[PDB]
Amino acid sequence: LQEKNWSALLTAVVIILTIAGNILVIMAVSLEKKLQNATNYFLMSLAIADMLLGFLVMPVSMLTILYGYRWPLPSKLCAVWIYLDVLFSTAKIWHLCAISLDRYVAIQNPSRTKAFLKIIAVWTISVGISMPIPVFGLQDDSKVFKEGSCLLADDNFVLIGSFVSFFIPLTIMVITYFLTIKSLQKEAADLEDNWETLNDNLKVIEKADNAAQVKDALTKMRAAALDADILVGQIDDALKLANEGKVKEAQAAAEQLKTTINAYIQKYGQSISNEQKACKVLGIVFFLFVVMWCPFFITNIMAVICKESCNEDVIGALLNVFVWIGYLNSAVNPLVYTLFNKTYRSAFSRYIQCQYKE
Ligand SMILES: CCCCCCCC/C=C\CCCCCCCC(=O)OC[C@H](O)CO
Ligand SMILES: CCN(CC)C(=O)N[C@H]1C=C2c3cccc4[nH]cc(c34)C[C@H]2N(C)C1
Ligand SMILES: [Mg+2]
């Protein structure tokens, strides 16, 4: 005991910011009805994972730092504590991958129960991924102990576990994020194309002298609206006048079509800027998970590669540092939501003032 007493002051700060911030997230998705969507339902499940990592794993870790990385508890709790840490971390990364995938599929498409079934699937996948760690590690203390330190000692568990709980969900998540960004760039682009078509043909109709010019322009306007409804019917109403030779009537109907076009373009176009706003916040969450966990997972693989060549006491001392940089990620998602989403910031501000009604 008290082999390192300076380090555990800092780790208590990281434990408290984790518990309290993620309690504010869980409260905001439970209570604030502007946050009742499928992405925020996933962000709450991530927050429970971050909270249970802060309650269950992180105090036991600080306890080991206070005992000189020398396991202070009953010995069959070591494999359980490895299992909790690996379960919450597997759940977190496949949540971010499910968010990224479900939001990409939403931009190639037109219930809380449907979100909640998916969350349960991610958690039940994560329990089955993490399952060999107590099943094998409780039967053999050499898979979870290294010189009285509780740490995942089995090299095949580290390699299998580094890919199926960090690198293959990351790969799917970074591909789906890029494709999502490209889809939004295609949808902001196709809209601008439809705007130019509609605006150009309205100017054609306003200068038109013959029915044929008006009819052709309205046919091209109808197609643009169909590519992007009330507008289509209004265009068809102008088309019948144009087919009837009522040029002046069709021209007056077209100046009225303009107000409807402005409303629809700005709405579908407000909702493209909002999806790019939302994608940008999830990108910071995705980025901060990877960059803060990269020094732990790269070094953990390098321990297994240069097992004998490298200084196992330096590598072991760097992993003790780098696991807490990764634990610090559990404090950061609530801060990201505060900085970039008004609804979370307002929710957090009222919950701190013990005002729980909207
Ligand atoms: C097919 C029948 C074989 C049964 C007898 C085998 C005995 C060998 C020991 C362990 C196996 C581990 C199972 C690995 C299967 C995938 C587990 C996984 O996905 O990850 C492991 C875990 O995440 C770590 O971090
Ligand atoms: C139990 C706490 N201890 C002992 C000091 C740690 O070393 N914790 C780290 C272990 C991890 C690990 C190692 C190997 C394969 C893996 N697949 C998924 C993970 C993982 C999660 C990862 N967690 C987030 C940090
Ligand atoms: Mg033009």
XYZ file of C-alpha atoms and ligand atoms in Angstrom:
409
model
C 0.000 0.000 0.000
C 0.957 3.675 -0.809
C 3.665 2.571 -3.366
C 2.238 5.419 -5.546
C -0.060 7.870 -3.653
C 0.330 10.974 -5.983
C -1.363 9.298 -9.012
C -4.699 8.328 -7.374
C -5.690 12.007 -6.730
C -5.815 12.572 -10.519
C -7.735 9.296 -11.124
C -10.501 10.327 -8.650
C -11.098 13.494 -10.744
C -11.544 11.282 -13.894
C -13.889 8.912 -11.936
C -16.124 11.814 -10.759
C -16.361 13.679 -14.136
C -17.262 10.321 -15.763
C -20.087 9.391 -13.367
C -21.599 12.905 -13.140
C -21.405 13.889 -16.811
C -22.874 10.606 -18.007
C -25.655 10.871 -15.414
C -26.452 14.260 -17.030
C -26.576 12.576 -20.517
C -28.829 9.706 -19.281
C -31.112 12.335 -17.631
C -31.259 14.547 -20.787
C -32.320 11.625 -23.126
C -34.818 10.319 -20.461
C -36.424 13.741 -19.855
C -35.817 16.216 -22.754
C -38.331 15.391 -25.499
C -36.331 17.201 -28.224
C -33.741 14.374 -27.624
C -36.299 11.561 -28.347
C -34.537 10.152 -31.472
C -32.659 6.904 -32.258
C -29.154 8.487 -32.290
C -29.677 9.961 -28.785
C -31.096 6.625 -27.566
C -27.750 5.066 -28.622
C -25.860 7.969 -26.950
C -27.642 7.105 -23.642
C -26.677 3.422 -23.890
C -23.069 4.613 -24.464
C -23.499 6.857 -21.386
C -24.633 3.869 -19.146
C -21.503 1.980 -20.407
C -19.375 5.043 -19.537
C -21.125 5.319 -16.159
C -20.696 1.601 -15.266
C -17.062 1.804 -16.376
C -16.723 4.796 -13.976
C -18.482 2.956 -11.115
C -17.170 -0.577 -11.436
C -13.819 -0.653 -13.266
C -12.091 2.683 -12.603
C -12.190 2.691 -8.709
C -10.712 -0.830 -8.684
C -7.970 0.398 -11.055
C -7.067 3.366 -8.738
C -7.029 0.820 -5.860
C -4.359 -1.199 -7.735
C -2.231 1.985 -8.257
C -2.401 2.500 -4.462
C -1.073 -1.047 -3.958
C 1.804 -0.806 -6.505
C -0.133 -2.708 -9.260
C -0.295 -5.638 -6.880
C -3.801 -7.034 -6.830
C -5.506 -6.132 -3.508
C -8.761 -8.146 -3.762
C -9.903 -11.799 -3.843
C -8.187 -13.461 -6.747
C -11.334 -14.671 -8.583
C -12.488 -10.997 -8.798
C -9.532 -10.284 -11.169
C -11.122 -12.069 -14.180
C -14.478 -10.402 -13.339
C -12.884 -6.912 -13.329
C -11.151 -7.697 -16.671
C -14.541 -8.909 -18.001
C -16.366 -5.713 -16.878
C -13.714 -3.439 -18.471
C -13.642 -5.442 -21.742
C -17.531 -5.649 -21.816
C -18.106 -1.851 -21.379
C -15.361 -1.064 -23.932
C -16.659 -3.588 -26.478
C -20.180 -2.163 -25.955
C -18.927 1.412 -26.481
C -17.125 0.840 -29.802
C -19.946 -1.268 -31.381
C -22.412 1.432 -30.249
C -20.407 4.029 -32.214
C -20.324 1.619 -35.161
C -24.124 0.985 -34.877
C -24.702 4.813 -34.747
C -22.565 5.341 -37.868
C -24.196 2.439 -39.762
C -27.812 3.272 -38.749
C -27.328 6.916 -39.717
C -25.874 5.991 -43.163
C -28.851 3.629 -43.847
C -31.194 6.510 -42.819
C -29.808 8.694 -45.686
C -30.483 5.711 -48.092
C -34.128 5.319 -46.799
C -37.313 7.327 -46.361
C -39.772 3.667 -32.970
C -37.969 3.693 -29.591
C -38.680 -0.109 -29.541
C -36.712 -0.517 -32.798
C -33.797 1.535 -31.362
C -34.063 -0.408 -28.094
C -33.968 -3.810 -29.865
C -30.756 -2.714 -31.658
C -29.118 -1.471 -28.416
C -29.895 -4.866 -26.769
C -28.328 -6.630 -29.816
C -25.082 -4.560 -29.405
C -25.028 -5.396 -25.621
C -25.762 -9.107 -26.244
C -23.071 -9.250 -28.971
C -20.666 -7.559 -26.471
C -21.439 -10.066 -23.643
C -20.715 -12.971 -26.099
C -17.443 -11.327 -27.311
C -16.235 -10.810 -23.707
C -17.392 -14.293 -22.582
C -14.073 -16.318 -22.761
C -12.391 -13.925 -20.225
C -14.217 -15.322 -17.112
C -14.894 -18.776 -18.766
C -11.156 -19.425 -19.298
C -9.564 -16.858 -16.934
C -11.322 -18.083 -13.772
C -10.165 -21.671 -14.511
C -6.501 -20.543 -14.978
C -5.059 -17.580 -13.037
C -2.071 -17.441 -15.471
C -4.385 -15.986 -18.179
C -5.323 -12.993 -15.886
C -2.230 -12.600 -13.572
C 1.316 -11.368 -14.245
C 3.528 -11.243 -11.073
C 0.543 -10.639 -8.776
C -0.830 -7.872 -11.147
C -4.350 -8.420 -12.422
C -4.138 -7.744 -16.192
C -5.112 -9.784 -19.247
C -1.970 -11.958 -19.580
C -3.110 -14.351 -22.398
C -1.518 -13.179 -25.662
C -4.186 -14.751 -27.920
C -6.906 -13.005 -25.893
C -5.086 -9.686 -26.490
C -4.720 -10.176 -30.267
C -8.283 -11.565 -30.853
C -9.623 -8.950 -28.437
C -7.745 -5.989 -29.986
C -9.305 -6.615 -33.425
C -12.858 -7.784 -32.593
C -13.207 -5.103 -29.836
C -11.227 -2.225 -31.290
C -10.031 -2.465 -34.919
C -12.821 -4.249 -36.981
C -15.671 -2.095 -35.448
C -13.433 1.027 -36.062
C -12.932 0.058 -39.725
C -16.691 -0.306 -40.346
C -17.304 2.955 -38.381
C -14.718 5.027 -40.382
C -16.005 3.683 -43.785
C -19.705 4.347 -42.907
C -18.837 7.878 -41.591
C -17.001 8.786 -44.866
C -19.852 7.388 -47.009
C -22.420 9.273 -44.850
C -20.460 12.518 -45.461
C -20.371 11.798 -49.251
C -24.164 11.038 -49.299
C -24.949 14.424 -47.676
C -22.602 16.138 -50.161
C -24.492 14.336 -53.034
C -27.966 15.439 -51.475
C -26.909 19.136 -50.899
C -25.595 18.963 -54.539
C -28.674 17.363 -56.198
C -30.908 19.958 -54.420
C -28.877 22.885 -55.814
C -29.266 21.257 -59.297
C -33.085 21.052 -58.839
C -33.148 24.713 -57.593
C -31.298 25.956 -60.727
C -33.692 23.953 -62.984
C -36.808 25.347 -61.267
C -35.413 28.938 -61.108
C -34.270 28.822 -64.802
C -37.681 27.537 -66.047
C -39.597 30.172 -63.953
C -37.571 32.893 -65.756
C -38.388 31.104 -69.093
C -42.149 31.161 -68.301
C -42.027 34.885 -67.261
C -40.547 35.838 -70.714
C -42.685 33.262 -72.653
C -44.874 34.476 -75.595
C -46.353 31.062 -76.645
C -48.046 28.125 -74.917
C -45.409 25.594 -76.124
C -42.605 27.423 -74.221
C -44.660 27.435 -70.966
C -45.631 23.724 -71.330
C -42.026 22.562 -71.963
C -40.773 24.638 -68.966
C -43.460 23.223 -66.611
C -42.664 19.636 -67.790
C -38.968 20.217 -66.857
C -40.026 21.860 -63.503
C -42.318 18.846 -62.714
C -39.394 16.441 -63.291
C -37.121 18.489 -60.947
C -39.774 18.433 -58.155
C -40.302 14.643 -58.756
C -36.493 14.064 -58.465
C -36.424 16.048 -55.151
C -46.152 16.554 -53.525
C -48.229 19.806 -53.439
C -45.726 21.452 -55.837
C -46.232 18.675 -58.452
C -50.044 19.121 -58.377
C -49.696 22.942 -58.628
C -47.336 22.433 -61.640
C -49.972 20.065 -63.183
C -52.657 22.786 -62.628
C -50.441 25.268 -64.538
C -49.786 22.526 -67.221
C -53.543 22.165 -68.016
C -53.785 25.983 -68.675
C -50.648 25.712 -70.863
C -52.182 22.760 -72.806
C -55.408 24.861 -73.138
C -53.425 27.813 -74.618
C -53.968 29.968 -71.467
C -50.402 31.402 -71.546
C -51.076 34.491 -69.338
C -52.996 32.348 -66.769
C -50.151 29.794 -66.617
C -47.594 32.640 -66.129
C -49.636 33.992 -63.128
C -49.880 30.425 -61.702
C -46.063 30.111 -62.036
C -45.346 33.314 -59.998
C -47.492 31.638 -57.251
C -45.542 28.317 -57.630
C -42.401 30.380 -56.659
C -43.431 30.879 -52.999
C -44.086 27.087 -52.621
C -40.666 26.287 -54.217
C -38.959 28.650 -51.748
C -40.669 26.954 -48.777
C -39.847 23.346 -49.888
C -36.210 24.140 -50.942
C -35.411 25.943 -47.674
C -36.980 23.124 -45.550
C -35.296 20.118 -47.273
C -32.208 22.358 -47.329
C -32.425 23.339 -43.608
C -32.708 19.574 -42.832
C -29.444 18.811 -44.987
C -27.428 21.431 -42.932
C -28.791 19.873 -39.671
C -27.718 16.309 -40.656
C -24.231 17.715 -41.500
C -24.289 19.516 -38.092
C -25.151 16.175 -36.356
C -22.636 14.121 -38.405
C -19.892 16.606 -37.353
C -20.636 16.115 -33.618
C -20.631 12.288 -33.948
C -17.353 12.630 -35.891
C -15.726 14.317 -32.828
C -17.102 11.504 -30.560
C -15.772 8.867 -33.063
C -12.385 10.690 -33.360
C -11.891 11.180 -29.585
C -12.608 7.475 -28.860
C -9.934 6.356 -31.422
C -7.189 8.939 -30.660
C -7.403 8.609 -26.860
C -7.509 4.768 -26.984
C -4.832 4.400 -29.726
C -1.798 4.599 -27.336
C -3.218 1.762 -25.165
C -4.141 -0.611 -28.033
C -0.987 -0.009 -30.161
C 1.322 -0.571 -27.127
C -0.734 -3.646 -26.042
C -0.099 -5.195 -29.466
C 3.629 -4.102 -29.348
C 4.029 -5.924 -25.978
C 2.822 -9.114 -27.722
C 5.050 -8.471 -30.821
C 8.418 -7.599 -29.143
C 7.679 -9.756 -26.061
C 11.373 -10.408 -25.240
C 13.216 -7.625 -27.185
C 11.332 -4.674 -25.513
C 11.518 -3.427 -21.873
C 8.429 -5.228 -20.410
C 8.767 -2.862 -17.347
C 8.637 0.278 -19.591
C 5.807 -1.175 -21.766
C 3.999 -2.195 -18.540
C 4.568 1.351 -17.197
C 3.274 2.927 -20.422
C 0.112 0.724 -20.445
C -0.567 1.912 -16.820
C -0.457 5.516 -18.164
C -2.335 4.904 -21.403
C -5.277 2.984 -19.916
C -6.209 6.240 -18.031
C -5.970 8.380 -21.190
C -8.496 5.908 -22.566
C -10.582 6.014 -19.344
C -10.601 9.879 -19.738
C -12.716 9.331 -22.928
C -15.619 8.394 -20.650
C -15.601 12.015 -19.317
C -15.575 13.659 -22.768
C -18.831 12.702 -24.580
C -20.934 14.798 -22.110
C -18.625 17.794 -22.679
C -18.915 17.378 -26.538
C -22.714 17.442 -26.259
C -22.516 20.593 -24.054
C -20.349 22.460 -26.550
C -22.145 21.596 -29.831
C -25.846 20.799 -28.970
C -28.126 23.472 -27.424
C -30.659 20.906 -26.106
C -28.019 19.094 -23.996
C -26.512 22.394 -22.703
C -29.991 23.682 -21.592
C -30.840 20.273 -20.097
C -27.505 20.137 -18.176
C -27.885 23.727 -16.925
C -31.390 23.084 -15.493
C -30.435 19.717 -13.921
C -27.552 21.418 -12.070
C -30.173 23.937 -10.725
C -32.465 20.978 -9.638
C -35.160 22.014 -12.119
C -36.321 18.731 -13.739
C -39.405 20.097 -15.669
C -39.101 21.656 -19.128
C -14.372 -24.494 -30.958
C -14.204 -25.163 -29.623
C -13.013 -24.709 -28.808
C -13.194 -24.795 -27.293
C -11.904 -25.002 -26.480
C -10.882 -23.882 -26.649
C -9.734 -23.801 -25.623
C -8.695 -22.712 -25.912
C -8.792 -21.447 -25.092
C -9.539 -20.366 -25.362
C -10.514 -20.188 -26.503
C -11.013 -18.779 -26.685
C -12.217 -18.652 -27.598
C -12.027 -17.609 -28.661
C -13.256 -17.387 -29.547
C -13.569 -15.929 -29.871
C -13.596 -15.078 -28.618
C -13.595 -13.590 -28.880
O -14.301 -13.147 -29.745
O -12.775 -12.817 -28.129
C -12.015 -13.323 -27.006
C -12.057 -12.238 -25.951
O -12.583 -11.022 -26.495
C -10.709 -11.881 -25.380
O -10.636 -10.460 -25.296
C -9.062 -4.476 -16.425
C -8.265 -3.190 -16.585
N -6.935 -3.434 -17.154
C -5.933 -4.103 -16.308
C -5.019 -3.127 -15.642
C -6.678 -3.153 -18.438
O -5.558 -3.484 -18.951
N -7.681 -2.560 -19.172
C -7.583 -2.440 -20.622
C -7.826 -3.799 -21.283
C -8.395 -3.867 -22.483
C -8.178 -4.992 -23.429
C -7.064 -5.828 -23.484
C -7.030 -6.859 -24.455
C -8.065 -7.101 -25.358
C -9.170 -6.259 -25.294
N -10.354 -6.207 -25.980
C -11.104 -5.137 -25.488
C -10.419 -4.530 -24.467
C -9.200 -5.226 -24.354
C -10.672 -3.374 -23.530
C -9.353 -2.758 -22.957
N -9.684 -1.853 -21.824
C -10.562 -0.743 -22.238
C -8.493 -1.304 -21.163
Mg -28.966 27.817 -65.011
